[PDB]
């Protein structure tokens, strides 16, 4: 009943014990993170005289092979990141223990996701949201550098995490299943609520595909509740669908998975699969996010930067991260030049 000379486990994973030494350098403390990739722990650097955070990845090889990528991408946009500005977060090295491969991450704070449930998904302001907004946008904007053409591949609130608690400042994490811009090897990519329609079609996919998820994730921001929330892609494309309408005809004609949400009719057209979902485009986010009706819930009644103009900017922007054609889908950089922003 042992496994690597008892320091793994079934799961091969390591055992995390508290105040254990590691390599007469780290002090572990306690375990944060937990994922398929491993384990996450919090520890304390002698060297560099800070806390950090060490990503544990399991003893095998389909994980360790898959970290490998992670720390290549990692290594490579540190190379171009240099003045640690544009919100990735900052692999500071990486090593071997007890055949593990240890990635040491700076310590960030609470995730996004963190947030929504602290304020029991209510949502945070639109002044906020802004920050993260633009934020993310030149996060966005730098992994669209032609040298790196990073594609995150899993954007969500809780790959999304405050540098300072007090601070608004944010930065990505996980890149485990980064997408370098390439043919398209895989199919079922990114979370699910999170999930593009190019993706859900089964169509090719590029960096655009994380703007659409942070359109979701910015109207989760200030709403508090996931703007797609489909227990499965049909229901996640119904969702979709009623709020945005039908998707234009030729992304249809070249979608290999259009029939397993759509029907094409002898008429050429396109219209939904039987199935509980409002007519297309009918719940529109207009009225989701509360323009005239004074925010999420009637909540921002009253607020500063919460005026109908505020949210009318807001809005037009996320509808463009949310365009159907991954084409005419807004980039990173014409999303920075939005009024919204200014
Ligand atoms: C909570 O502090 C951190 C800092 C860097 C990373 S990287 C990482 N990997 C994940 C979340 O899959 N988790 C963290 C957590």
Redesign the pocket.
Known sequence: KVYNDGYDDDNYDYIVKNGEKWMDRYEIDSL??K?S?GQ?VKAYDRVEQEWV?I?IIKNKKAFLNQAQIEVRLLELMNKHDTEMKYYI?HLKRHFMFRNHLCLV????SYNLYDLLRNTNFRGVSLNLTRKFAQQMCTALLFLATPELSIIHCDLKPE?I?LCNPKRSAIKI??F?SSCQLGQRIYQYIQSRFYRSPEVLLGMPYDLAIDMWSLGCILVEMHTGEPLFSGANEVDQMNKIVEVLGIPPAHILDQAPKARKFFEKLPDGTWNLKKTEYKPPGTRKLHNILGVETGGPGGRRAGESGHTVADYLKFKDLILRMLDYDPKTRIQPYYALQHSFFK
């Open positions: 944060i993170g994922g990739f996450v955070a990503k977060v991450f700076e310590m960030l790959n995490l994490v996980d485990g």
